[model samples]
Target: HWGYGKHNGPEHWHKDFPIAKGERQSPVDIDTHTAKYDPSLKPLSVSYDQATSLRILNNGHAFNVEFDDSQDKAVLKGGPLDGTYRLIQFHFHWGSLDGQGSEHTVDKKKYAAELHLVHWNTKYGDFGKAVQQPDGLAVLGIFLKVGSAKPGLQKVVDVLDSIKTKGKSADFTNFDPRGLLPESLDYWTYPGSLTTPPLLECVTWIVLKEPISVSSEQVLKFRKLNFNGEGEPEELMVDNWRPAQPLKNRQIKASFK
Candidate 1:
């Protein structure tokens, strides 16, 4: 009922997931001027063991790279979070064109795409149990630009052809998540929920100020990917991103200039 289309989409998500319209909904506009620059914010410590990357899957909605989070091998600490959170998986959100894709915006300007590195608070328990708590999750959001192909991201793009259809999956391993970051560790933090339905208010979002670059040609391939299942109608996966939501009383806190 909350699918992305005429009868549904973000606008209709609230029908099924009352929290969709919750105060802390994500994909908000980041007004840099209004964001509080907190010098006390510590540097984000991301330790992801390259060997932990297990598989990549096309979930009929978005492509996700899952990892072996059975242990504390891959975790994100510092920044705005209290304890070390384990990296469970990572995925992307984008639009059909370069002008519109990212879920969150900077000064109301949207980028070509957004990459989400999902983490769960191992301090509480497993992802399932932690997701219901206020301080249970943390997500690193990085914006992607259209330019020359990003060398670090090229490895991920190369495999898109194999997982072009929904339910399609392939073994993906040895990829390091560190290569995806920008030179600057600066970011904006805010309490928010999952943009997707059941839009749980569990995440503390750290959105990087700097964006990585991508080739124009590669951007086109994103549109070529399909959202429908292997047997369903061929639905092109484009503009598969949620628009910016209300900021409410939450203030955007920054780590640096």
Candidate 2:
């Protein structure tokens, strides 16, 4: 099984998913000093319909709040993308401790955790087909620091108890995905791949400059999740993050100075 275990961890991912070593591999450390501000970049547009939220699930790897992507009900546009991308799901990657959880870092500084809002370009028809195109996916990354508990995040944590084990899901509807965003949408954009396996290089990464707050206690709640299901030996779901990969020939562009 592909997981964070030593035997099947990230370093070993390239064996089964050769694209892990691709040129556009993601979760790269963002060197703020070197990131150029692009005046040409337009402000991002986000529109999420509360009705599009479907359910929240623990899929063994990470917990995801899935959305209805049959239409452009919740779409992300402008910024670095050429067309509208429909929101399909959102999830998080975190560590066991607060010091080093986030997959993408700012100036090599890791936050307690990171949130990913996954969207697929509607021009490609569907997610399956989009995953194969160079500009088919766009992922919004928001860093989570340990401080005041985020109100939007609290709603998500409250449901963690119901889906503690793998393969469990509960109806989670009418949630506004925008509640988790920072005040400013200023961000760093780059060409990258999916942090997890299949490691497809179709994503256009949009990592926010400002971080949202999450208390130490709230972070602990995420640690309580298990990698295994009922009747199986419990494997704590901690440090579910992929390390920063080589930046290669990519240049990270910033939307703000």
Candidate 3:
């Protein structure tokens, strides 16, 4: 069990986890202060044959999925973006309280939680190398709410029975990430730096406008996650999400078309 220390929660992730310092974080608060700025972002054309490998790791902090890019492809058509990219790792950010689990805040309103789907430009050899590039990464933000139940995520929950002891993860196979996507693809796009430190300024962010609903019970299950090593369980690791920040002089564009 991972207990919540004064600086152990999401608010102090940068301090606790060194790797998180350089990660491209998500769930930024979207607000009216943001101007209607639009950019010609590249269009993504993913082929069904693109094989994807998923690895769910018990990263002391949370259950983060590390993806292998060699198996995926992202063909870009016309737009501000142009080029092929590969799927990288994806992760989640949640809160102890259901009312405020998301990393990004829209108009200062918080949701149950948020998910980040990370991708990297193929121009760079691999995700490890791409992460260091300025224009190497793209992140898709999806919001999770505590309401209405969801059968789609049940598979993920079922596996919790195996890894309930913390620092333990079973090899998750035959899972399609598309099932995790929200019904609406409408999104807010922007160019920004990673939320974590080293805070690499190398990500094109796409935040979904629609949110998926999970049960309050599901939110509680997430709270039960611990940060302790495999053998000894510590305290519950709830509220592992960062607070939203200002957009500064940046413009956020929506996919109206």
Candidate 4:
């Protein structure tokens, strides 16, 4: 019912999920001038067990690499969080072309793409129960810029052919998500909701300041994915990113001075 098409795109989402128009909606423009430096913020701690990555699938909206969250093999902690959050899955959002695609922007500047590593608070039980609470989820947002080919990203790109259409999935294991991160962990954070439906306002967004490199050829692989199922009309799954929502009364805090 929900997709990135003209009739059922982001603008039409509020009709189905009223939270689409909420004040704390995510992917807001991070105005560096207005973002205050918070020295009290702790260094982010990200540790992955390497065996946690279970599978990769195309879910109509974006390609996702899910993990085994039954245990705390992979977790995020420290920065802007009171307790540990277990990693469930990681996905990406991109545009039809290179100039635009990222959900969150910097001073109105859009990146080629954005990666979201979704995690849930362990204190709230499972993801279902945690998603309903304000402090239940934490997402690490990393921007992608067009440049040199990313070796780590190539592993994911190589498997795209196996899951070209919606609902398609295949085994994708032993992938350490940490390989996709930038050298620096400097970030801007704020309380925001999920960019996608149900649009739950449970995420504590930590968007990285530095972007990783992705060659044009690599991004082309992402564009080959189909929004429709195998027998359905072939609708390309490009521009899967949502437009930036208003910041409203929320203020973005930067970890660096």
Q: Give me the candidate number with maximum TM-score.
A: 4
Residue 94 lDDT in model 4?
A: 96
Candidate 3, 158-224: lDDT as tens digits: 6655665456767766556676777776677777666554456677877777898888877677777
Of the candidates numbered 2 and 4, which has the greater lDDT value? 4
Q: What is the RMSD, in Å, between candidate 2 and the native fold over all Cα?
A: 0.9
lDDT of 4: 0.94
Per-residue lDDT over 96-148 for candidate 1, one digit per residue giving the tens place of the 0 to 100 score:
87899999999999999999999999888799998999899999999999987
Error of 3 at 147 (Å): 2.2
Comparing 1 with 3 on TM-score, the higher-scoring candidate is: 1
Per-residue alpha-carbon lDDT of model 4 for 202-246, expressed as tens digits? Answer: 999999999999999999999999999999999999999999998
Candidate 3 positional error at 195, Å: 3.4
Ranking by TM-score: 4, 2, 1, 3
Model 1 poorest 10 in a row by lDDT: 1-10
Model 2 weakest 10-residue run by lDDT:
45-54
Rank list by lDDT: 4, 2, 1, 3
lDDT score, candidate 1:
0.88
- Native-vs-model 2 lDDT? 0.93
Q: Residue 120 error for model 4, in Å?
A: 0.5
**In candidate 4, residue 111 scores what lDDT?**
95
- Runs off by more than 4 Å, candidate 2: none
Question: Which of candidates 2 and 4 reaches a greater TM-score?
Answer: 4
Residue ranges of candidate 4 with Cα displaced over 4 Å: none
Clashes of each: 2, 0, 16, 0
